[PDB]
């Protein structure tokens, strides 16, 4: 790196003036009045000159034209003809043009990339360069005047660089170039060649890309932009942004347009790759490649499997090119969409791949010798079949597991040098083929129907039959009629609730575990007696104690409850925690540390080295100290006695995110044994600032770091930045709120106002102690800080909380978006208004997750009041996790003074419910804007629970009508058995029939929203041509 400056040779004219006072002489410039006299300083030389080396030289001249002020604009006037003279090197040269002065590069033509680059310049400055000229020059417009304030002899440059922000116009050359254009519009004119573009998000103008006639390929970056942003436009080249000025990808001739397909990709942020495929007509733009590990990033909360991020294309109108390669991970998959297979290819031997069918494609596995194949429990209907190809080792044989599948019934099959194998549970069934490699099935590979029962693949083949092909390999004995399985997948936090049955007098809970660790169930019996846990066919229940329950792993248990009081009971679910006392080396495959919630380390001697393999650690910010710093902000760092804990979250394939707490026994010295007393930690505070080592146990100082996938855990460094907090707590601000704190629609209650501006993502927290932690991030660039608002004891409060917190997000444009954010259970609704422009969006904790992330600039469709507020009730009717985690809070919330009762205070919090059959539905009768009323009935029933209530499955026979209330207050409720929350919505009441959705007609299936209104005396009683509602 070279920095230049503009240095002139002077010549100083000089003469003697003779002092008489002090009879001394001293040099003095000479008189401008005497005759005529040279200047006292004149310049000679206004050159500089740089010869570059072997390696890679990057010049920076001053920047004497950094912005439009009138003195600086006069600097570079005035230094526009000092010569610059760089030559570059065969490594490589960039410069950086300071903005003034005659520029002669010199750039080697072997080097592999000469860059030009023009960002020292104002921000918005009109910049006009043509790779093509040998010579040119970079006009500043003056007042007036036009001054030629740059001169530029190029020669070997292929990198030009745009201005910041500025209307760039860019022409290259007929060889390779890289444009980094601007965020200000403008026009790029690629030459012939390969050319490559980078193109920032926001654009103030639209951009014209020119594809020349002689060009050859061209690749677009966009290191900023999702491919949720872009619009996909059909028979055009050109990128198209849901909001903001797009890219006008052009041709010189349209008539040769066709021929960039398969020459123009475009690369997006997310790991999508587009492509340019000739079509039926033209070209389109189909998606070619997926990097899952940054779509995953960019989507934390969703499902980031290859069939799941199809079907997420598909719904979002984006073709596919004719082969999709799914890179990333530890296979690589590819899809064909014309015969609809998807294809897996193993690599790395003794991998765990877990396969799972899907109901749009059938899917293909290629392994690789001495693998481990887990088939999936079958969830869906319809499951394409699913092919297993095994590669005939005989020293490393591989193995099938149905363990996680529950299987009940296997039948076996042989069709052409193939096994092919039913695996069907209760409810669902799934066809697996089971074929080799060489025409041969080897009969070393080890079928493990059930746990202590593994079986030979040659012996699965030898009581198969050629004729009469379908028998029995496996059935499961006689079990108990399942009223309600609950998967203990779900944590902690369930509530689980059987209604009462008329006569049966036994209802049965069935508790199932599909993983490889044992739980242990902490529950508690609210409503109902536990006749014992079932153990065989036809022997006695076996009594059990609802506080601690173990529950093998791939096991099941059946509890059994009398059928005459409902059963409510409230389960904690925590698996096992893993011990690991040996030395050396400590490495666990992926499946075995996301098995695990807890992993203890009890050094007998020596503590080992942790390597959690695949592990990518889930962060908001890219800077590691400032993502350690937050993380030590919320409460992820425990130290209690010699021991220290660490909570880390990571991204997973499943949706949502994942959640590990790593705890090192005896990591301190015995002087740390004192953490009871603050005094003592505070004199050792300022040690573990200083020096860390000084108080680590010496089994521990050689395995400070822990081998997190790609990055690397140093548990010195979270020790001293968790003292430091404790320090400061005795940039990130922390904002304590309670019920009643903060000023005084659905925002009726207090509000709360952010002090600061905000980003556009955000983060939720739900501590184990129940603590709502939203966490937001200063718009500020130059420097990373995040203000937390803090909510304590939110979860035992939740319906105590009205408040809304208000927020600002600026954009680009010199524009402020409005958001406000409203707590409302596990649901954090937030409303954007933009200036009106109002979007609604929001997102629910589930399955004891404690951890919600929400980026704006990840969806490209705008939802209003209506469509959001409407989406809730598909979702509801689909038994979405959303809708069974308002639920599960809301019968949490319903036991909060030991004995249920559903207190008014819970009535605004919570929409109604109502689910009518009708005999025969108009299509378009009801239209947005209707007033609909109660029939002269009693009292019309109204439910807040639709889960598991049984109050919202299909009942009766013909159309089906689900309805949703806005406004419950002021509605009586009836007297609640434990676990039922019925309100009795009084007669007569009006309707306003709002966003009436009918997209499942042909399913028997009519959507209604509705909102409350007084006694308007008018209305739909009895409704037309009979059809009572609201029976």
């Known amino acids: ?120 310049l104002p921000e918005e400055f009109p910049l006009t360069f043509d790779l093509s000229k040998q010579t040119q020059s970079v006009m500043l417009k003056t007042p007036d005047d036009e001054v030629p304030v740059m001169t530029i002899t190029q020669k070997g440059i292929n990198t030009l660089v745009g201005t910041a922000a500025g209307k760039d116009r860019l022409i290259g050359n007929d060889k390779d170039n890289t444009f980094h254009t601007s965020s200000g519009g403008g026009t790029v004119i690629s ?120 079907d997420r294309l598909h719904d979002m109108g984006w073709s596919l090119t004719p082969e999709v390669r799914f890179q990333g991970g530890e296979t690589q998959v590819s899809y064909d969409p014309l015969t609809r297979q998807l294809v897996y290819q193993l690599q790395a031997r003794y991998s765990e791949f877990q396969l799972a069918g899907s109901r749009h494609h059938t899917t293909a596995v290629t392994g690789t010798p001495g693998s481990r194949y ?41 069709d052409k040098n193939s096994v092919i194998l039913t695996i069907a549970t209760i409810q669902y069934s799934l066809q697996l083929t089971i074929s080799g490699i060489e025409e041969s099935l080897p009969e070393t590979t080890r079928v493990a129907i059930q746990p202590q029962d593994t079986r030979l693949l040659g012996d699965v083949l030898r009581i198969l039959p050629d004729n009469g092909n379908w028998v029995g390999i496996f059935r499961s004995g006689h079990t ?93 679910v925590h698996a096992a925690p893993l011990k690991i006392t040996s030395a050396g080396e400590m490495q666990l495959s992926e499946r075995q540390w996301q098995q695990q919630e807890h992993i203890i380390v009890k050094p007998d001697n020596e503590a080992p080295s942790l390597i959690l393999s695949e592990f990518r650690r889930f962060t908001i910010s890219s800077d590691k100290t400032f993502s350690l710093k937050l993380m030590c902000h919320q409460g992820m760092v425990r130290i209690d006695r010699r021991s220290l804990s660490v909570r880390l979250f990571y991204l997973r394939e499943q949706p949502g995110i994942g959640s590990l707490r790593l705890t090192f026994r005896d990591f301190f010295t015995e002087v740390m044994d004192t953490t009871d007393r603050e005094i003592l930690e505070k004199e050792l505070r300022p040690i573990l600032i200083g020096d860390t080592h000084r108080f680590i146990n010496a089994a521990y100082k050689n395995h400070l770091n822990i081998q997190l996938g790609d990055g690397v855990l140093n548990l010195a460094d979270i020790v001293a930045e968790y003292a430091r907090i404790q320090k400061e707590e005795t940039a990130i601000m922390t904002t304590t709120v309670t019920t009643d704190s903060g000023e005084l629609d659905d925002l009726s209650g207090r509000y709360k106002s952010v002090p600061m501006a905000r980003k556009a993502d955000t983060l939720y927290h739900l501590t184990p102690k129940g603590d709502l932690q939203i966490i937001y991030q200063v718009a500020t660039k130059m420097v990373n800080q995040a203000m937390i608002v803090s909510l304590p004891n939110y979860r035992h409060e939740w319906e105590k909380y009205n408040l809304s917190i208000l927020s600002e997000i600026p954009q680009n444009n010199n524009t402020v978006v409005h958001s406000i954010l409203r707590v409302n259970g596990p649901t954090m609704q937030v409303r954007t208004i933009d200036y009106p422009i109002v979007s609604f969006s929001d997102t629910t904790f589930i399955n004891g997750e404690q951890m919600l992330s929400y980026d704006s600039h990840s969806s490209g469709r705008v939802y209003s009041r209506e469509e959001y507020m409407m989406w809730e009730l598909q979702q509801r009717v689909s038994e979405a996790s959303s809708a069974r985690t308002q639920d599960y809070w809301l019968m949490d919330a319903a036991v909060r003074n030991g004995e249920w009762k559903i207190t008014p205070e819970l009535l605004r919090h919570t929409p109604g419910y109502i689910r009518s ?76 029939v709002t966003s009436v959705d009918e997209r499942h007609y042909e399913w028997n299936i009519i959507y209604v929203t509705l909102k409350t209104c007084g006694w308007s005396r008018n209305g739909q009683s009895k409704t037309p041509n009979g059809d009572n509602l609201f029976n």
Not at 24 to 48: F, G, M
Not at 389 to 398: R, S, T, W
Not at 529 to 558: C, F, M
Not at 952 to 975: E, L, P
Request: glycine share 8%; charged share 20%.
């Open 1 to 120: 790196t070279i920095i230049l400056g503009y240095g002139h040779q002077y010549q100083a004219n000089t003469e003697i003036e003779y002092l008489s006072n002090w009879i001394v002489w001293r040099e003095a410039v000479p008189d401008s009045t005497s005759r005529h006299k040279r200047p006292p300083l004149e310049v000679l030389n206004s050159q500089c000159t740089v010869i570059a080396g072997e390696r890679k030289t990057t010049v920076l001249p001053l920047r004497v034209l950094s912005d439009l002020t009138p003195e600086c604009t006069e600097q570079a006037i005035s230094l526009k003809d000092y010569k610059f003279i760089l030559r570059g090197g065969s490594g490589g040269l960039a410069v950086q043009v300071g903005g003034a002065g005659y520029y002669d590069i010199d750039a080697n033509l072997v080097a592999k990339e000469n860059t030009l680059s023009f960002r020292g």
């Open 191 to 310: 030459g012939g060649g390969n050319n490559r573009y980078i193109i920032p998000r926001d654009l103030k103008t639209p951009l014209t890309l020119t594809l020349s006639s002689n060009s050859v390929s061209h690749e677009i970056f966009l290191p900023e932009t999702t491919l949720a942003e872009l619009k996909p436009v059909a028979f055009e080249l050109s990128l198209i942004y849901w909001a903001g000025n797009n890219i006008n990808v052009q041709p010189e001739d349209e008539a040769k347009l066709n021929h960039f397909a398969g020459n123009f990709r475009v690369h997006t942020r997310d790991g999508m790759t587009l492509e340019a495929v000739s079509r039926e007509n033209g070209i389109q733009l189909a998606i070619s490649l997926c990097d899952v590990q940054r779509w995953q990033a960019v989507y934390p909360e969703e499902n980031n499997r290859p069939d799941a991020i199809l």
């Open 917 to 992: 059959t009708v005999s025969k539905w108009s299509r378009g009768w009801l239209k947005t804007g209707t007033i609909l009323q109660t029939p002269e009935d009693r009292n019309t029933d109204v439910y807040l629970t639709t889960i598991q209530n049984n109050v919202f499955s299909r009942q009766g026979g013909g159309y089906q009508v689900y309805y949703r209330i806005d406004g419950m207050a002021g509605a009586d409720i009836a007297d609640n058995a434990p676990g039922e929350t019925r309100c009795t919505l009084r007669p007569g009441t009006c309707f306003e």
């Open 480 to 572: 108990p009629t399942v009223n309600r399985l609950e998967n203990l997948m779900a944590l902690n936090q369930v509530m689980t609730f059987l209604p009462r049955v008329s006569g049966s007098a036994e209802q049965v809970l069935c508790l199932e575990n599909l993983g490889g660790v044992r739980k242990k169930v902490e529950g508690e019996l609210l409503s109902g007696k536990l006749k014992g846990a079932w153990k065989a066919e036809g022997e006695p229940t076996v009594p059990v104690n609802i506080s601690d329950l173990s529950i093998p792993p791939y096991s099941r248990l059946y509890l059994i409850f009398e059928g005459k009081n409902n059963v409510l009971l409230r389960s904690k």
């Open 374 to 414: 887990i088939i999936m429990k079958p969830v869906t209907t319809q499951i394409l079949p699913t092919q297993i190809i095994l590669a005939g080792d005989n020293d490393h044989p591989e193995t099938i597991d149905l363990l996680e599948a529950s299987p009940v019934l296997v039948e076996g099959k042989k």
